[PDB]
Amino acid sequence: LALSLTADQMVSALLDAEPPILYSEYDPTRPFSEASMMGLLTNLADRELVHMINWAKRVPGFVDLTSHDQVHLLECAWLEILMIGLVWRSMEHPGKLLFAPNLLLDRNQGKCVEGMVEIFDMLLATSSRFRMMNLQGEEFVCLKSIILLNSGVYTFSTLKSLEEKDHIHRVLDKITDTLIHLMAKAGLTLQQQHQRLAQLLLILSHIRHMSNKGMEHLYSMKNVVPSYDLLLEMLDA
Amino acid sequence: SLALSLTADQMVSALLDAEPPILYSESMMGLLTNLADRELVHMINWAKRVPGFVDLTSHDQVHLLECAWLEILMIGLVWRSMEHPGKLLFAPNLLLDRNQGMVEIFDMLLATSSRFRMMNLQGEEFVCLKSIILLNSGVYTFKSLEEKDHIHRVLDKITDTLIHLMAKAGLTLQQQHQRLAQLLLILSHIRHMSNKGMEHLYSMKCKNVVPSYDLLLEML
Numbered sequence: 001l002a003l004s005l006t007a008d009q010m011v012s013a014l015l016d017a018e019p020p021i022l023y024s025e026y027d028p029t030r031p032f033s034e035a036s037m038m039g040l041l042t043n044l045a046d047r048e049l050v051h052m053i054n055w056a057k058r059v060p061g062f063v064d065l066t067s068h069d070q071v072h073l074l075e076c077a078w079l080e081i082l083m084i085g086l087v088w089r090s091m092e093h094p095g096k097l098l099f100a101p102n103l104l105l106d107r108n109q110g111k112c113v114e115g116m117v118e119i120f121d122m123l124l125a126t127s128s129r130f131r132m133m134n135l136q137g138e139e140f141v142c143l144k145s146i147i148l149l150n151s152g153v154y155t156f157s158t159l160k161s162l163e164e165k166d167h168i169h170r171v172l173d174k175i176t177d178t179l180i181h182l183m184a185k186a187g188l189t190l191q192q193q194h195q196r197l198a199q200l201l202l203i204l205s206h207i208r209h210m211s212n213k214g215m216e217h218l219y220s221m222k223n224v225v226p227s228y229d230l231l232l233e234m235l236d237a
Numbered sequence: 238s239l240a241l242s243l244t245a246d247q248m249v250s251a252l253l254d255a256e257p258p259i260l261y262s263e264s265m266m267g268l269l270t271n272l273a274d275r276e277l278v279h280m281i282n283w284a285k286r287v288p289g290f291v292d293l294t295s296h297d298q299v300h301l302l303e304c305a306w307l308e309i310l311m312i313g314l315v316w317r318s319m320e321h322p323g324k325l326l327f328a329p330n331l332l333l334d335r336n337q338g339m340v341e342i343f344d345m346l347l348a349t350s351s352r353f354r355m356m357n358l359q360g361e362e363f364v365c366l367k368s369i370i371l372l373n374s375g376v377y378t379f380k381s382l383e384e385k386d387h388i389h390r391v392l393d394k395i396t397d398t399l400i401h402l403m404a405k406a407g408l409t410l411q412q413q414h415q416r417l418a419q420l421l422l423i424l425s426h427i428r429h430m431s432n433k434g435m436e437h438l439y440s441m442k443c444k445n446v447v448p449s450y451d452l453l454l455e456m457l
């Protein structure tokens with residue numbers, strides 16, 4: 001059904017699929033230690049993951065994939081999705097990261113965990129870049145769906161496999177069409193439309209980078225990462 | 238900036254003419270390190286000819302190269318291996334396949350090579366993509382505000398260059414932006430491959446081959 005959506009139907013589907021805003025655990029002891037703060041973020045992240053599978057099942061075209069390739073895309077994308085959501089929540093709070101409405105952290109609180117100030121600096125800079133470009137909500141939900149479909153597609157010798165990759169790349173093309181259509185409705189010229197598209201997609205490489213760093217530093221300290229069976233369990237419900 | 242007055246055809250001509258030669262190979266990590274060592278010297282001199290790159294302070298040029306150096310090598314590899322399905326053409330005399338492989342990276346590099354082949358990636362588009370990698374990889378990690386604004390204009394020029402090439406080649410508008418999106422989403426997998434390779438380099442204890450900031454400033 002996904003490839004039959006017009007642009008505006010794609011936007012509506014994605015908007016209505018949006019996950020809820022969750023709160024951090026209430027009145028934790030502050031200030032934080034390294035362990036306690038990581039406990040809070042791990043607890044929030046784990047609760048956001050249930051809602052991210054609900055959201056992914058509603059991304060047009062996702063369900064058409066085999067459960068195996070659904071899990072694979074979520075394994076590859078889950079941190080990038082958590083991170084772009086964090087950056088979007090944080091746009092209107094310059095200098096700060098809004099992990100939850102009750103958990104707004106300034107730069108110097110990232111120092112609690114050993115090398116998580118560097119990722120904080122990267123998330124803040126991305127939020128400024130979104131604020132500069134005046135990223136629109138309809139653009140964000142498109143970008144977040146691109147992350148889900150694109151991040152894992154390149155590491156899927158059966159003929160079945162080529163069919164899903166083509167189906168991926170067809171949905172991605174449709175979300176590209178959708179992004180362009182929103183820009184044209186906004187009133188951007190063709191040249192501005194092309195430049196803004198590239199410039200939203202180029203930011204995705206940095207979000208990949210941040211995600212890879214996040215994992216990397218995490219390890220240099222592991223089991224907290226969600227397992228295949230866990231993602232696959234949650235999917236089957 | 239004369240970079241910002243360039244037409245699409247001047248931009249391609251500048252990048253095509255700055256293309257480094259394909260070098261030859263002459264322990265498998267030793268061979269690759271020797272090759273990469275020689276590849277680097279050409280990449281600095283190539284980066285200096287990317288339009289709008291020398292208008293950056295030497296501090297910012299180094300930061301971009303430090304961020305982008307392994308993505309640039311990797312995309313070169315993928316481009317050389319594109320007509321050798323199943324194999325990676327590290328050099329005309331060092332063509333390897335999966336068995337010789339670091340199997341994780343190899344399969345990611347091969348999948349990237351197959352994607353470029355599936356899309357019929359053109360050499361004019363190739364050079365455009367490497368320039369983007371160089372200018373985009375470290376711009377978010379950065380006087381500072383004039384610098385970033387300059388880099389985003391040059392990036393807009395390369396976008397215009399890519400779109401112009403497609404328009405010539407006969408693609409419709411819808412095919413043009415779809416084309417542009419597919420090329421740019423591949424860059425995000427190249428960044429991922431660079432990160433994997435980078436942590437792997439350190440995992441195998443060879444964290445000395447990563448050119449440092451000072452080394453790049455010196456070569457520059």
Ligand SMILES: COc1ccc(N(CC2CC2)S(=O)(=O)[C@@H]2C[C@@H]3O[C@H]2C(c2ccc(O)cc2)=C3c2ccc(O)cc2)cc1
Nearest residue numbers: 266269270273276310311314338339342343434437438446
């Ligand atoms: C035996 O163990 C291994 C562990 C890893 C690998 N890797 C990829 C495996 C092949 C699929 S890799 O990602 O670490 C790294 C990127 C690419 O392959 C390596 C390499 C390089 C870079 C600088 C060095 O000083 C030395 C090696 C690469 C490279 C060099 C030149 C070039 O033009 C293009 C790419 C290989 C062997």
